[PDB]
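Lab notebook, bench 4. We co-purified these components, and the gel suggests they stay together. Before we commit to crystallization screens, I want a quick structural picture of the whole thing.
Request: model the full complex, all chains together.
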Amino acid sequence: ENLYFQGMARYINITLEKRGVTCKALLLDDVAPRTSKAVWDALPQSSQVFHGKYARNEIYNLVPAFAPKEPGAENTTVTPIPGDVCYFTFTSNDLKTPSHGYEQTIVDLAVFYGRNNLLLNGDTGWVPGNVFATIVEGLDEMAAACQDIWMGGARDETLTFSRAE
Amino acid sequence: NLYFQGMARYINITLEKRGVTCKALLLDDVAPRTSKAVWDALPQSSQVFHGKYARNEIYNLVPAFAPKEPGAENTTVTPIPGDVCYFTFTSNDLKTPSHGYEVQTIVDLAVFYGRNNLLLNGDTGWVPGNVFATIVEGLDEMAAACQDIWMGGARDETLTFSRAE
Amino acid sequence: MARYINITLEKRGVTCKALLLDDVAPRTSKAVWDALPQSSQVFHGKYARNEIYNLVPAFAPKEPGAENTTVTPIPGDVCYFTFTSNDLKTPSHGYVQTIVDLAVFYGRNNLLLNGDTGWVPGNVFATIVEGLDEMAAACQDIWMGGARDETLTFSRAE
Amino acid sequence: SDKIHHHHHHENLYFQGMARYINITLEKRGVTCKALLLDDVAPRTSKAVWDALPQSSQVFHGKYARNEIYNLVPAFAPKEPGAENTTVTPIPGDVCYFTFTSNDLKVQTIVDLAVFYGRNNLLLNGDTGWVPGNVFATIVEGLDEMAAACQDIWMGGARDETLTFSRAE
Amino acid sequence: GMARYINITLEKRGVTCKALLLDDVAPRTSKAVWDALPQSSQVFHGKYARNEIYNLVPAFAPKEPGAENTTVTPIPGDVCYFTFTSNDLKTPSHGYEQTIVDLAVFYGRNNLLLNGDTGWVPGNVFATIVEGLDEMAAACQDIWMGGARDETLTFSRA
Amino acid sequence: MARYINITLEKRGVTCKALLLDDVAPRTSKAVWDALPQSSQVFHGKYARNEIYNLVPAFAPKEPGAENTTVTPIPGDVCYFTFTSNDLKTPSHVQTIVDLAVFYGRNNLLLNGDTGWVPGNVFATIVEGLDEMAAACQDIWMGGARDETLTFSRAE
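Here is the predicted assembly.
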């Protein structure tokens, strides 16, 4: 049935390198085929982690665009739930702004570790993310590591997405 | 019981660990009940938190201190740089899975250091805050310190509101 | 038996007629009808879009509470809002007692949503059944030509 | 801290040890799922509902909240729980409690007991704006089968269909 | 040019209403649809936009009209056109049992075209129901309570 | 070097001065600056609250696209929106039209019932005369916009 990968379920590891916490997520080859393939083909992807300021129970990284073509809207949400792993296509203009306050095409790879989140901000309104993976192992530990990023900072911390094989 | 204020009053807002203070004009004329409730009870000091949904926000949480809560007064759901806000909450509002902190009335005293903020969450929808002060000196320095809380954490950091005199 | 109200711009001399929604907004309909006429300075909405309204002191023995509410008012809607002094006397607004906002929606694609508190539902208590086009034109003229010396008056239709 | 960690762990075991469950059943289609009552985070609402079970009434599919079915019953608690563990973004498996009046839905107090069977839902309508629900249970068995039944309510209708909340043995 | 009208029909229930095609304010969408009528497919009741029924058909215009006369607050009697892709619709969040067009009828009020997939979903308002709205609304409530099995929504030239 | 624009209501004779945000909105700032002056019939906002604006045919060789956007504009913001005739020639209220807007108060939402959120490019911030401009905008709200013209020009 699946558009691209038609074998047994594939999985990605999602790792905070400094804290050394990893969880594992099912790749949604069925309902997000283009986003899943774009990410999978490009793994590993690893960069400075950030805690969300508006989308709530969220951590994410920012990487240069990697796919030959961006997937476009696919399996989108503006109400991400615990365990969602999301992909966003942004431009420099979207992110390099006073409202963001950080210290080409950019991809945001995000993990939602809690509930009651809205992908909505005062820059543009709604910001839907492609849901392309779902955490199936280690979610509680990841959530605890993310609360520690919120309270204890993201200095020298790196979020890495890799193939679990 | 008008509790008239004929001259400008100011509060200092200080991050103790980082050692950064800014000064705010108290909005005695447009937020008289809130301004009094806060003024009369200063200093108020507690662990700082960075917002997860309201964006460019830091705040602390203290036990109710006023003889009676001010109610809605000079409210915003679009807080701006320099806004200092007061929120009345109950334990049920805050002690939630969606908040993920590490019946009683609790006051949130918040500082908005940047723009493009929405006081909206996935617990209840809009969460209006009473705007009761506006930062008139040291906003840039405070904004820099708050980005350092976002990136460097809030461990052992304390937000303190005090009378300037 | 259906009851109707007249809604009039005194200076422009434009009136329309509305059916009072006694069936689905009985408490609001009664509160208003019993107190008519109600007349005051007109204002054009700055956030709710195709709206004019007035502001009057509370008139009912007790406020109706939420009833037949909308945050998506449509052309022809007549709405009632209960506010306090704190709601209206703000910098955001640029104009401890209870105030009633009586509102006419003359066009579509309106949201009763503002940056002070978020959603502001109105009780929909009447629907304009005659002279909506003319009223709409007069409201556009309030938008472009101002509200100076203009009064919005609600009255019982005979 | 080690103290906090251990406390959390202890608290979780306690609530596991006294876990109670409710059955949620569509009577005509004959489909039941089981939900854990959230005595830890929604103690007031969980009690108010447990105490009054069973509760059973005509089912409705939501028209604004999306992947939702619900019933409406007269108020049953001696006092309403008030806002507790609320969401405006309900998720698959959530079971929600709302207090309404006759004016909200058409002066009587009515309870809306709701099951969310899919995702990407917003508890927001054109009458009042946001309508938060108290999340008081989470479906732990039969969610897929319940979701398939709810889709069939959506396409096939709610006629003669009853939604029943009951205590699980 | 003279007013053109369309009939909107539920084939199983046998209920038809008539709408004025909005050639003046939605000319591209009005043309796209008129030229391609009849359009007829399985009916669905909305799950998020409230008092809505609709069908889904393959794209039929030589080119899509694009945003025209849009609303996210549709009102009773609105007929709306949306352009979607299979990605917008074939989702877990939709739970249904390429360019696709959604032709929608709004039979009641207090509707928001807003969902948890993408946020706001504006529709092009291209017709307004002028006869039979009350009967259609009653049929649509009956789709809600009684289901959509073997029911077909048909748009045709009047 | 900082560049400044004057924003003037011609009939009321009220002018304020705005810093052009060449750092954070370079494309929009250049597009506007290179086309000044721009001057047209003033309107008060009906949805974005504490707002006046004008509408002018597109002037730039190419539209800036999204840049430094807000849906929560604040006092002193000057915003740029690119619209088509379809966006604006509606009952609710193709050629490319630009809306140049001044926000004179707070608690504004750039959100409407036509399309939802309508982000504006923030390209200048009023640094002098805001109080006077706000009083004049309140007078447009109460006293109308007839024969009133909003003019954006280079400060000498």
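Residues 2-156 of chain F form a domain with the Cyclophilin fold (CATH 2.40.100.20). Worth comparing against the SEC data before the next meeting. Helices of chain F lie at 26-35, 85-88, 130-143.
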